[model samples]
Structure formats: C-alpha cells, structure tokens
Target: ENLYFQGDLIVSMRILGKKRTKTWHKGTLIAIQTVGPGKKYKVKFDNKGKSLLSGNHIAYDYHPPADKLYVGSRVVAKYKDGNQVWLYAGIVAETPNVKNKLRFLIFFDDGYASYVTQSELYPICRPLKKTWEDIEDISCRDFIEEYVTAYPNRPMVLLKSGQLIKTEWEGTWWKSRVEEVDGSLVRILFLDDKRCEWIYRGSTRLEP
Candidate 1:
C-alpha cells in the first residue's frame, strides 16, 4: 500500500499550475483518494490549494513504493525498540513505501509488532544462544555458533566484560583474557578492543 499519513508534505512530479508551467507543485497529503497500482491522492498545495492527483505525480514526500520482500520474509530488524531485540523472526506487518524503503512491522513473539527501518535490518541468522537453532542452521562448525556460545552470561565469548585467553576463532589466532580457569565457561575479552567469545578447555589451548 503506497499510503500517505495525514499531514504528510508532498510535491508534484509535474507542473500543475494554470497554463501548465514547468514547475513542481508542493503540498501536504490530506488523505488518500485510492491506493494500489494507479494510486490517486488528495493533496493540499500551498498556492493552488487542494486537488486530486495520480501517485505518479504526487510524491507524499518520502515514503517509497512497495518491494517484493514483504511481510513474510524472515529477517532480523530494529523496527521499534532500542533495548529489546529479536532473533531471526518473521515479518508480521509492513508499511509499504518507495521501492526498497519499506518500514517493516514484526511480532517478536511479544504480541507487540515492532517497526524497523531498512537500514537496521539484517539477514536472518541465528546470532544468539536461546534464539539459535530456530531461524538458521545450527551446524557445529558455524563460527556464529562458536562466536555466540562462548560467553559466561550466555554461551559465546562475545564483546563484553570478561577475562583474557588465547585461542583460534574464525581462523584467526586470538589471544583473549577470560574471567578465570583452565576449564570452565570463560568470559573472554578479545585483545582487539571490540571482540570476545566464550569457550572451554575442549575448544583449544586455554591457559589461565
């Protein structure tokens, strides 16, 4: 639905003044006359006042057209909240806009549908522990597995407060500092300023 909210400022793609001058008409979307393909709009311009125009000419200023990726494509997004997060979840709702700029709506199993933009969106991947194995493959060799499952607070040695140790993760030999122990769930703090993960004695040569 190429919808325009009330009070949405818009502009015309073509010149619509008397005598049809080569200038665009700026206006606000008072209401939607019709939607879908062949969309018509009710716009109130500054100088010329209100009139009905085709969506092809009436740009309600920013909302883009709908794309193929609709309310079903599995994704990880930031539709609504800043603190709460969702795993590889399903899109329960959508706000169709310009091609590729649609604001997605999702229900993170909370009955509350979050609204996320296209910028904060990412591919559906199992990046966390409890939410893992549900959206993406839980292949043991998966780096994301070893990456997210190595934390004490969770499972993965992640980017948070922890001890230091040395190990090879995702092919790189990382010397990380863990909370403690030669054989326990260590909260590893990677030396690289912003990297960490959880691991035990079975994973690699972990020295206290």
Candidate 2:
C-alpha cells in the first residue's frame, strides 16, 4: 500500500558488496517499475548520481540518532572504497579521546573494520513495541540488578516498585518513581507532574 510518487523525496539503501552489506543515500525519486512482487525505484542522489534500487531498500524520513555511542554499543556505519560506499552493522570496539576530538573504530559484523566519525554512524535497529503486551518474553532483570549494584559513586540498590529512577524528559534526565514493572516495561510517575507513563526497562537508571 505504501508507494513513492515520482517527485517524492527518498533515501536509497544500496548493496555494497558480496556479503550484501548496504548503505543509505538521500535522493529524489525519479521513476518506478513493477518488475516483480515488489517494485523498484530509480533515484537521483544528492551526490549527483542515479541508481535503480530495490523497493525494499528505500527508507523514508530516516534520521540518525543524536546521542553519542560508547564502546560495545551497536551501530551501523558508512564505509567508502573508491567510488563505492557501504553500510555495515558493527560494534564500537574502540573510542580514543584526544583534545576534544573522538573517533570510533567499529568492528563490523562482516569481515572488515573501519574507523569513522560520529556523523557517519547510525543507531542500531531496535524493534519498537508500542504497547507492553506487544513485547515478547524477555528478562532484563539480571542486567538491571547488576547494573544498579555495580554502579560506582551511586549506592548499590535494586529497582523496586517504589524506587526512584531517572528518565529522559524534554531531552534531559528527570526524576521518576517506578510504579509497576510489567516484564520489559516499567510504569513510571514523573516526579514533577505526577503523570504516569510506560517506558522500556533499559531506558531508566536508578536515581540517587
């Protein structure tokens, strides 16, 4: 049911190499063809080039995350070789800071690795479960428990129903209290407004 019109703005995911590695390029949709079960679109890239890419490779309104990544964080990074470019899933292997500058060495899921700046990196895909019931059985309690107790400078503790936690609000971490825990979701009441909301288990930290 979702299809692109001729003048629609789009981004194309292009196959990079033999391992089926891919990358994204923003462009304008030039044309479309129903070659098979899925349609393919021809895109005119902002880089002043054009390519016919698969329908499934097209992503709309894609925005990379604004947060900084840490070692062991999952990411997708762009790699360029000559005139070709690729995007590959990787883990942040190293981050060396120097003179207010930072660079990350990413070990890709594929065979090779690359050094890239933050601008070239995208967040790893995490499935969105709009409701608590939509999430499957997953236990993050052990991680939470260990993280709570092991966090230095902060008191060793556990997340109980009445425990205070810090959660993101309006781009800043704010205080909230845990009201309930439903598997991977936590029902929290904001400290300021007393407004209740459900958030992912990993999204909150123990508030001192």
Candidate 3:
C-alpha cells in the first residue's frame, strides 16, 4: 500500500533517531526495487544528483500542516472586517498563556493586530474559508465519507476533473474535487477553502 510509481514527485530526507533532519531534497522517483519487506527508491533530486533511498528515507510531498503554533510562525487567521468575516494571512505576534481558552495575538497582512482563539486559526498551508456558512456545509459532507479510506485493491481507475472525492490532511478529511490526475498523483481542489494542491494517491479516497 506504500507503493509509489516512477515519476512521482517526492521528498527524500535523512531520518535521525526517527526524527526528520533539517536538510531535505525534492526529487522525482526514477525506480523502485524491493529489498526484503521494504523497497529502495531511486530518486533524482531536482537540480541535484541521483541517489537511492530506503522507504523511511522517502516520503510524499503532501505533508499535513503542523497543528501546534509558535511565535513568528506564519498562519491563516479568521478576523472580522467591517460587517463581514474574512481569513487573512498573518504572523503570530505573541503567544500568551490563558486559563479560559487558547488565544494568541495575530498580526494580519492587512496591518491589523488582534487576539484570536485557537478555533479561528489554521496552518498556513490550509485553505481559508470564504464564509462561515460554507464551513459547516463541507464539514457535514466530509464526515459522511470519513470512514472510507482508499481503494487500493480495486482496479486503477483514472480520475477526471470535477469529480467529487475526499482528501485527508492533518488526520482530518475534506470534501474535495479532482482538478486532474497524472499517473499515481492527483490535483485536488478542496471545497471548503477552495485551495488547490497536488497530492499523492494515498491522500485521496474516491467515491461516486
């Protein structure tokens, strides 16, 4: 189930004591050779040389955004602008300890700073909702397909654009649509935030 075909864009990094190292390389898979319950991946790093890597040394580029926040970290925060609420790109100006709730001082891109709770913040890689109503709508649908993971045993069916599906990120699933499918990879457009990103086959779960 962890199989990755040739030509898939991936990342190779050194894992030191089960922890990912700071240095990494972006590459495309050239070939895969099974090595006794595991596989060695032949990768060609972008603008770099080629090398072979083990399974643990390689991973898909579709990494779930980190849930924890740190001061000076880039984030997407929800803020009310005049009569409407909007999600703005911001940086964490301050992280304070509060008893009642998790709150932080966010310095938004619009030159405004305000206190926002944890519920109003999202990782920078995540898409921001355009309106509060749409958030509820997608969450309702996302839960419906939450239990169904991937269809690996099924035949490889080519996905077309505009087909409804689900994409998993940060252990949460989102209602998404396929923008395109290239071999074992997919381009997904998340309905909740309307952001598009290329994902590996493992991140997608298809349904009719």
Candidate 4:
C-alpha cells in the first residue's frame, strides 16, 4: 500500500557510507532529486570531527522536511557500504505526507539516530469523559460518600473544622471553606484551589 504523511512522518533506513570530500562532518540532507522512477535523496556528514563516526553502523534514521527540508516527512539511512569504510550514499522512494501524525526523533547514547511517526508506529491512549448527569450531580457529599464506600488506599486532605461552605462546581455542589481575610469580606477556598470572595452585601437572611 501507498504511505502518506500529513502533519509529520518518520522514515527508517540503513546508512550506507559517509561522504568524506565535504568540508564539515555534519550530517545534512543536500538534495532531493527526481530519478527515473523514484526520488533520489543525498545526505552528507562531517567525518573529521569524529563525533559522527563513533556510532555503531546498525540503524540510522533522519527526519526530513526540516527547516531546510519539508515539515512532515523524514528520511532514514542505514550502514551497508562496508565494514569500516565510508562513502557517499543515496536513497530513492515515493512517499507522501499524512495529517495529524505525531512524530519524534531518537538519538542513542551510542550515537545512532532514529525517527518515529506516531500514526504508523505507535498506539495512542485517549481520555474518556464522564456523562453529563454523572458530572452535573457531582458534589462534595457524593465524593465523600464514594470515598468512604470504596475505602481507597490513598491519603486525602480534609478540613477538620468550620462551617461546610458550598459552591457550584461543574453544575454540582462542592463543599469548601470560608475564610475571613480582612474587612467584612469572606473568601471561599475550594479543593481545586479555586477562590472567590463575597463582601458582606447586606443580606435578609441575617437580621443585624
């Protein structure tokens, strides 16, 4: 089947050899030329620095569409030239970009490099949301009831004193705490760190 890369893609291959005639020992994609039936690509690296030559000739991958290449495509070359010698190498292939592809690169401690395209190589985990009713009727009492019923193996922060202040959270009642900071205003602190202050706006419930 034909492969396409939209947001990002990671291509894997073996590095054949190294180009020694270049001035710097940096691995770089030089050109993307169209060959007879496929696209020919070239990469050069600095060999004089010794940093690029220390890695094992196992598997080397490269990401393309970089600042100099494309944004969502990658290229990987492996070592297949010789045992210890290096030479200029090229690869030909037909590839396309797909959408929303999560991509990342890996650099081994031994100096080997590789690329990963999330859509093609890895499984993604998604979070499931609770139903509207389950969340709407959520309250401090409900939370405490559930916790007490379950007897989970976890430590929870609890308030030992003061009136049980209540607040609306996600369309539910949440028990909180009221603190008299300064003046005649009171601040409500919720478990989630949300706070709101209510100034003593004359109330009919309390006859003063």
Which sequence of candidate numbers ranks them by lDDT, best first?
2, 3, 1, 4
Give me the displacement of residue 62 in model 1, in angstroms.
Answer: 23
True-vs-predicted CA distance for residue 61, candidate 2, Å: 7.0
Give the distance in Å from residue 28's predicted Cα in candidate 2 to where it truly belongs: 12
- Give the distance in Å from residue 204's predicted Cα in candidate 4 to where it truly belongs: 11
Q: Residue by residue across 47-126, what tens digits does model 3's lDDT show?
A: 66677664434444432233456554555566654454765555554454653144576655444445677766654322
Q: Please report the candidate that would top lDDT against the real structure.
A: 2
What lDDT would candidate 3 get against the real structure? 0.50
At residue 113, what lDDT does model 3 achieve? 49
Assess every candidate by TM-score: 0.23, 0.31, 0.28, 0.17
How large is the C-alpha RMSD of every model relative to the true structure?
A: 16.6, 16.9, 20.8, 22.9
For residues 1-208, what per-residue lDDT tens digits would candidate 1 score against the true structure? 4454423333332222111232244455565544443445666666776776543333222222245344443344443344544332333244445631544544333222445665544433112223333323334324323433453232323322454456665666677766443222344567776554444333343442
- Deviation in Å, model 4, residue 190 alpha carbon: 0.9
Query: Model 1 Cα RMSD, Å?
Result: 16.6
**Model 4 global lDDT (CA atoms, 0 to 1):** 0.29
lDDT string, candidate 2, 103-188, tens digits: 66655543234557777776533311211111122323233333334432323334569887787766687788989764434577
Locate the minimum summed-lDDT window of 10 residues in model 2.
127-136
Give the winner by lDDT: 1 or 2.
Answer: 2
